[PDB]
Amino acid sequence: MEIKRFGRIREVIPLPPLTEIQVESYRRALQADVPPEKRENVGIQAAFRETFPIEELVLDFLEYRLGEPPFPQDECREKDLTYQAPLYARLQLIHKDTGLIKEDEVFLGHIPLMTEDGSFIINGADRVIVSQIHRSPGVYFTPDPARPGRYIASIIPLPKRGPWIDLEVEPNGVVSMKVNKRKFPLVLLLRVLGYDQETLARELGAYGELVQGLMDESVFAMRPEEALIRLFTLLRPGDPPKRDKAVAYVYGLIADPRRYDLGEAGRYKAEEKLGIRLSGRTLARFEDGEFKDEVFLPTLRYLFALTAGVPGHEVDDIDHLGNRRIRTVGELMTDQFRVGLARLARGVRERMLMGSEDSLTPAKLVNSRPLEAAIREFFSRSQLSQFKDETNPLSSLRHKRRISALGPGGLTRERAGFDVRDVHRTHYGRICPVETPEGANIGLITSLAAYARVDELGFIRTPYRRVVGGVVTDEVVYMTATEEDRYTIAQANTPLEGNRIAAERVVARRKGEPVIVSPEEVEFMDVSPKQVFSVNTNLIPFLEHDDANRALMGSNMQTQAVPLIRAQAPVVMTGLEERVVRDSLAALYAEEDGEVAKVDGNRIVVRYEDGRLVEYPLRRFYRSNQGTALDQRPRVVVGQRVRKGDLLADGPASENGFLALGQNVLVAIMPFDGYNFEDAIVISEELLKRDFYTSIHIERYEIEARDTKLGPERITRDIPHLSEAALRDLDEEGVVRIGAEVKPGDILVGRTSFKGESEPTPEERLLRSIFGEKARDVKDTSLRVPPGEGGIVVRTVRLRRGDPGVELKPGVREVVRVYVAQKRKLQVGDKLANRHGNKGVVAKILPVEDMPHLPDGTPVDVILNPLGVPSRMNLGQILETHLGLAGYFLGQRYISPIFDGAKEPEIKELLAQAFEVYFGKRKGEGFGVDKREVEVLRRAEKLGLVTPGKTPEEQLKELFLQGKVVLYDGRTGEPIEGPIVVGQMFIMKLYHMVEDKMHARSTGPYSLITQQPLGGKAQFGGQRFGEMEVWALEAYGAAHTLQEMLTLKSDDIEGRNAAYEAIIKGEDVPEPSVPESFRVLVKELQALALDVQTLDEKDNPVDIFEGLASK
Amino acid sequence: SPVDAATQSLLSEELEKALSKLSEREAMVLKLRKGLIDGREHTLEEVGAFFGVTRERIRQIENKALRKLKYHESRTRKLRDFLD
Amino acid sequence: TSVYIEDVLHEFSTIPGVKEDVVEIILNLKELVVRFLNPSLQTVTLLLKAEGPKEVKARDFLPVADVEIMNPDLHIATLEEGGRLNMEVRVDRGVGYVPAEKHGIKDRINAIPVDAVFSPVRRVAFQVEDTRLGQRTDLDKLTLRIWTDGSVTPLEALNQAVEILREHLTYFSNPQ
Amino acid sequence: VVGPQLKLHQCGLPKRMALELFKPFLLKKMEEKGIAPNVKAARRMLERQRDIK
RNA sequence: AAUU
DNA sequence: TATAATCGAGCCGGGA
DNA sequence: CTCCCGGCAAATTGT
């Protein structure tokens, strides 16, 4: 079919590589493909130079190398292994006394590798490292909230790489410095740096009242040494002020490039704000035996001039995106590497004391356990290392571009107010204003804008076009927020003739503030509207018509779309849906030009120009993290001539290379008999018939057989007391056969466990004895299908001990995994959504004959209630339908970009051409206007919809141009009394499916200490009837209902047993007993040496333990 | 669990209903041999000492006791469902 | 209603040499329109064996007496050099839409039950137009458009429809 | 899910949910009707989903 | 981290 | 059982 | 005043 694209905007540059924030960051950290002498000092390289040399014997760092991975990516996932490279380091040991040099290359453990698409494999599971926003290091000046006319100067280093410093000017007039919660007069520190009153008096004197608050006579009376000892006694009480000890403490706090690290970005921000040059990343130096100042005097100088109102001095906006920077994967990982490196150094010095002080190499001196643990800790347990969202290809693409303000070195959820969550003006073009979580995390987690890229310092830059004179260049400059505030930036839609600005007045920005400006004043221009929003937001056509709160839901919900076997691209696209599939890496493309040699379900073989025969295996029905099926399908045929970059296979949720998150269905907007109520959705059974919204899902089942003190667990087909019906589908070994249909209760893997010591009860001994089946040594522990699950068995993996290549955790003989697949047809309770935030659960499935239908017999697919539109103010879905109607008859799909889209006249033109096909066909076939079409036309003209006095064809066309048609009720045959909006809409089946959520429990597992039911469906849990639920029962005055919740249905052990027995005997449930959790409370208060006594009306003790606890 | 408490209780009650339908002398031997009394499964020689008879005599009343037990079971179908 | 492909254990399988996965192959078999000439024949079993670089269409099914394939051009599987496709498809007569989970029909162990859309009727519209007997006005002219897959005829449909409706009106006979 | 046809005092309750929620009651009724020999046998019949008549 |  | 080793490394309200 | 301790919605799921 035809693809018609709208919009007049010529975008000078394509979207950047979308995972570059991930891919480029880690490559930069490892530099594995760079030869060691040419590596720059960054990432891993910089970490080594910081930890070494290790003094105390001196151990020095030469170079490192990364090996090749022990196992490929597919293999790691199979075996629950981390995808990683061996790290080695060449170290030379020197004895400073002797001169002796022993050198060896020591093994430091493994480092995890990033895959091509920017993710990790950590113990078999795919993970993503989320970038972290935080305050950029540098020197900031903020207004003091208490005293309006005064200011605070803060010197902030990288997280955990030094303390925060505050320079406050107290009301008494002296400049105070705050470090580690302790305050003192800053003058003391100035003297330690070697400043004398001559230098300080003459330097800052220009500011009249301020220089005197710095002057303290007693401090000048003492040399830098007396001042150093004096300060140390202030900061560390009780520690003897030994002269070598004070240098050591103070040096480590200020001048040590090992214990105090300003950023590289910190240096630039400092150099730029104060107009100085830093020799390094420390606030001071230890040079020529004394301390030599770097930062403090320039920072003190700026503070005094600002309080005085000196021109050229400003306060810093701490939420400005120039002062807030991104910590990418590489930087985050390197930080953990540096910590692990420092612990290993602690280990070196302790080994340089014990055992032979002579006979030591680097191999005996280095224990890498501290390093392996630090990295394993970051990847396994960090708050920024998250389980990959791979529900659909877009899920993972969005995850990698997310920005978190939480995690180790940022806010807590109870610790962040409004300012951080707000949308700052500098977010324009950098961080998306729409795509953020609804709920507690709103504004803390955000997403990178489409055209944004993070530079080497960690600041987000966004592209703009140069405008010189009135000419718009094609040169794009990626700008930081700080640099953007200098210019006047015109909007991207400002009219153009050629490269010349064609409007006399343009809409532009100065510091984000909107302003109207002449073409002479235009320094730059936005590249595109797409640059303001995230990738998800950019997939919403007609976004300009949707209220943001709903567009937010639209963005996020595409993340949850389940891959459909029939998945299709939307009939109205934004033009980004090709790039997302390509950068996602689900789809497979041709490397160079060539010819297709072979096409299979399992593989595609291509003959290139090179003559070389390249084979691309295809991932078929593989189970993703969320159980959606990632499966690739071949899109070319044998012998097809393909070019470089031509599509070879479709990934999941892609159709001919376009993102397919859903289906295009014929929708009617109208109430329908209350099945539409309050966002519910009505669908045609025709959708299931043709397998729309059907998705494949795979669940993984696992079981271990382990050594016990009672003897081995065995995986066997021999299970005590089981029929051949129950074992039918198990193979020789006890594993369910591939292909069998398994239903709840069915055995997946047979297993036996040795009966404990209190073996069969004497009751059981005698019962079995009666039947002459002597009691077995083992019990049936087999893995079974959980309630509500089941499907077709597609795979089994078995891993024993003693088979090549596999070793399990201690005690585990063998591990068996069963992969079970299901084709899920759409059903009542499943959740649907469009890209505009309209979401609802399927409440009714009508037979095709009940569905409203067009006069020519075509029934609609979905009926959405119009009551969902007006309050939500998301009208893009309406425009989507009109253009979708036109496309249904013209057989075409459209690209309408955001904010430069199809407009009403253009949609009307397309609709007229459609009407010609929808109607002229009928008139030629020998059919005229319907009687009922006339009745509706009568009522429509009463509505002012059609012009009175035109022919029925003319009026039906007037309605068709409003996107409305005559609709017949399939029940009656009578028309709907008014014309109804009908068209093609793009709707997704989200990951929330009743099959997953339905749960019920009579009785089941109980908790150890409280004896209350466990929680959650997976444990067969009970529902929590919490405080507020108890209030409800109380307000109803339902005392006996409530007491049941508190006793027989929970932790009253005696009561629940008796209550169950009564129900199976037909008796009424007995009166309850003491809840066991009260007994727990009583004993816990006794453990606190508090005597809690239940007493009767006579004040005599009542024993709620029934004699069991008294001697 | 509530189910288990119910199940084991019902089983103890049906077992006793069947053992009272045995002579006292031949029901006590079965209880001593399967451990329902004292928790231990007594040897054939020990049961001989407490009823003062021969090790073979005690084996004989256990099989006839167990056989008579088996007969009452085929008749009332009471204990069959507890075999799981 | 059911499919057995040789050396295929379940629906999520894939066949060497064949481009389509089994899910798509069964999706194509759901479009097969199969007419039973003998009214007494309620179930049959089509056989297909193909190899080599050929595109299997519905014609390649082995002809069976009293059975006509109304769409012999329908694509089934694309096979490539060395690709071998051998299957047995069980076709039944029935009513309405009976999904695979419902009937669960398997001729043999490795059989894949298939969702059955039995109804031969593809589309139904009816026009109501104005007419007169020249004295009286607002009379109705009724035109029923009926499309079918060809196994049953638009007219045959209409008679069965009328016959069903007639038989239903009988049910009003015995009151209580 | 919305249930327009319900009277105000009613709700739609999935049969599979009700079988679990009412399971003890259901066992007794399965005994009165000859559907199972006794309560213990009735529960075993509900355990496997293909065993439910 | 999700859903309401 | 014996060279000698000798001091660590988030905002808010309310009540003493 | 300053500081020190106590608070800071519910149910559900997921690796």
Curated annotation (Swiss-Prot), chain A:
Gene Ontology CC terms: DNA-directed RNA polymerase complex
UniProt superkingdom: Bacteria
GO molecular function: DNA binding; DNA-directed RNA polymerase activity; ribonucleoside binding
Keywords: DNA-directed RNA polymerase, Nucleotidyltransferase, Transcription, Transferase
One Pfam family hit: RNA_pol_Rpb2_7
Signal sequence range: none
Catalytic reaction(s) noted: RNA(n) + a ribonucleoside 5'-triphosphate = RNA(n+1) + diphosphate
Biological processes annotated in GO: DNA-templated transcription
Catalytic activity, EC: 2.7.7.6
Summary of subunit composition and partner proteins: The RNAP catalytic core consists of 2 alpha, 1 beta, 1 beta' and 1 omega subunit. When a sigma factor is associated with the core the holoenzyme is formed, which can initiate transcription.
Protein family membership: Belongs to the RNA polymerase beta chain family.
Function per UniProt: DNA-dependent RNA polymerase catalyzes the transcription of DNA into RNA using the four ribonucleoside triphosphates as substrates.
Record's protein name: DNA-directed RNA polymerase subunit beta
Record organism: Thermus thermophilus (strain ATCC 27634 / DSM 579 / HB8)
Swiss-Prot record, chain B:
The species this protein was found in: Thermus thermophilus (strain ATCC BAA-163 / DSM 7039 / HB27)
Compartment(s) of residence: Cytoplasm
Subunit structure: Interacts transiently with the RNA polymerase catalytic core formed by RpoA, RpoB, RpoC and RpoZ (2 alpha, 1 beta, 1 beta' and 1 omega subunit) to form the RNA polymerase holoenzyme that can initiate transcription.
Residues shown, of full length: 340 to 423 of 423
Name of the protein this chain belongs to: RNA polymerase sigma factor SigA
Comment on protein domains: Contains 4 domains, connected by flexible linkers. In the active conformation, the domains are in an extended conformation, each making extensive interactions with the RNA polymerase catalytic core.
Name of the encoding gene: sigA
DNA-binding region: 44-63
Region (Sigma-70 factor domain-4): 18-70
Family, similarity comment: Belongs to the sigma-70 factor family. RpoD/SigA subfamily.
Function of the protein: Sigma factors are initiation factors that promote the attachment of RNA polymerase to specific initiation sites and are then released. This sigma factor is the primary sigma factor during exponential growth.
Highest taxon, organism lineage: Bacteria
UniProtKB/Swiss-Prot annotation, chain C:
An example Gene Ontology biological process: DNA-templated transcription
Domain of life according to the entry: Bacteria
Catalytic activity annotation: RNA(n) + a ribonucleoside 5'-triphosphate = RNA(n+1) + diphosphate
Region: Alpha N-terminal domain (alpha-NTD), residue numbers: 1-176
Function comment: DNA-dependent RNA polymerase catalyzes the transcription of DNA into RNA using the four ribonucleoside triphosphates as substrates.
Protein family according to the UniProt entry: Belongs to the RNA polymerase alpha chain family.
Domain characteristics, as noted in the entry: The N-terminal domain is essential for RNAP assembly and basal transcription, whereas the C-terminal domain is involved in interaction with transcriptional regulators and with upstream promoter elements.
Subunit structure and binding partners: Homodimer. The RNAP catalytic core consists of 2 alpha, 1 beta, 1 beta' and 1 omega subunit. When a sigma factor is associated with the core the holoenzyme is formed, which can initiate transcription.
Annotated protein name in UniProt: DNA-directed RNA polymerase subunit alpha
Organism of provenance: Thermus thermophilus
Shown residues within the full chain: 54 to 229 of 315
Swiss-Prot record, chain D:
Listed name of the protein: DNA-directed RNA polymerase subunit beta'
Protein encoded by which gene: rpoC
Region forming the signal peptide: none
Family, per entry: Belongs to the RNA polymerase beta' chain family.
Oligomer and partners: The RNAP catalytic core consists of 2 alpha, 1 beta, 1 beta' and 1 omega subunit. When a sigma factor is associated with the core the holoenzyme is formed, which can initiate transcription.
Spans through the membrane: none
Species, as recorded: Thermus thermophilus (strain ATCC 27634 / DSM 579 / HB8)
Entire-sequence positions represented here: 632 to 684 of 1524
Described function: DNA-dependent RNA polymerase catalyzes the transcription of DNA into RNA using the four ribonucleoside triphosphates as substrates.
